[PDB]
């Protein structure tokens, strides 16, 4: 039923941020937030 | 047609007094044209 | 480091596609250890 679970997950409209990755030569971590004009920056997700 | 009526938000489902959270999520009018996210599917699409 | 190295421009919006949740045959029930299962199936079992 994992397939049914993912089907019911994908039934909903979705949005994504895309990233293109370039080597840096170290151990980097990114902190990503959304900035609205009429609000304060709010953290989104975690990545490195 | 009636685009102003559509941009109008539905009531009283908008207010937080509604225990059901799905109505608060979908208080709009445009999204309702698709029932993918509503979660209920009719078994048969025939007519007698 | 300069955050401009990576590209954070494009946004991808994908409409909720179809879903086929009808039909379940040969339900390979898998009886597991009691202590292995987690809270949500615990609660479903309790309600049942």
Which positions in chain A have a beta carbon within 8 angstroms of at least one beta carbon in chain C? 4, 7-8, 10-22, 24, 28, 30, 32
Phi, psi for A11 (deg, rounded to 5): -65, -20
Q: Identify how the structure was determined.
A: cryo-EM
The resolution, in Å, is 4.4
Interface of A with B (CB under 8 A): 8, 11-13
Q: DSSP character for A32?
A: E
Tabulate helix, strand, coil % of chain B (nearest 5): 25, 0, 75
Contacts of B34 (CB under 8 A, 6+ apart): C16
Q: Are C29 and A48 in contact (CB under 8 A)?
A: no
Gap from B28 CA to chain A (nearest CA, Å): 15
Q: Distance between CA C7 and CA A22 in Å, rounded?
A: 10
């Amino acid at each position: 039923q994992l397939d049914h679970y993912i089907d019911e997950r994908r039934t909903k409209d979705r949005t994504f941020v895309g990233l293109h990755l370039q080597n840096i030569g170290t151990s980097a971590l990114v902190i990503l937030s959304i900035k609205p004009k009429d609000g304060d920056s709010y953290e989104v997700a975690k990545l490195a | 047609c009636s685009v102003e009526l559509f941009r109008k938000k539905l009531e009283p489902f908008d207010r937080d007094t509604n225990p059901i959270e799905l109505t608060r999520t979908y208080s709009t009018a445009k999204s309702l044209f698709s029932y993918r996210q509503l979660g209920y599917v009719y078994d048969d699409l025939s007519l007698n | 480091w300069p955050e401009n190295t990576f590209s954070h421009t494009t946004i991808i919006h994908e409409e909720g596609t179809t879903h086929e949740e009808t039909g379940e045959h040969q339900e390979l029930h898998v009886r597991s250890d009691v202590s292995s299962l987690t809270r949500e199936q615990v609660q479903s079992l309790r309600e049942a």
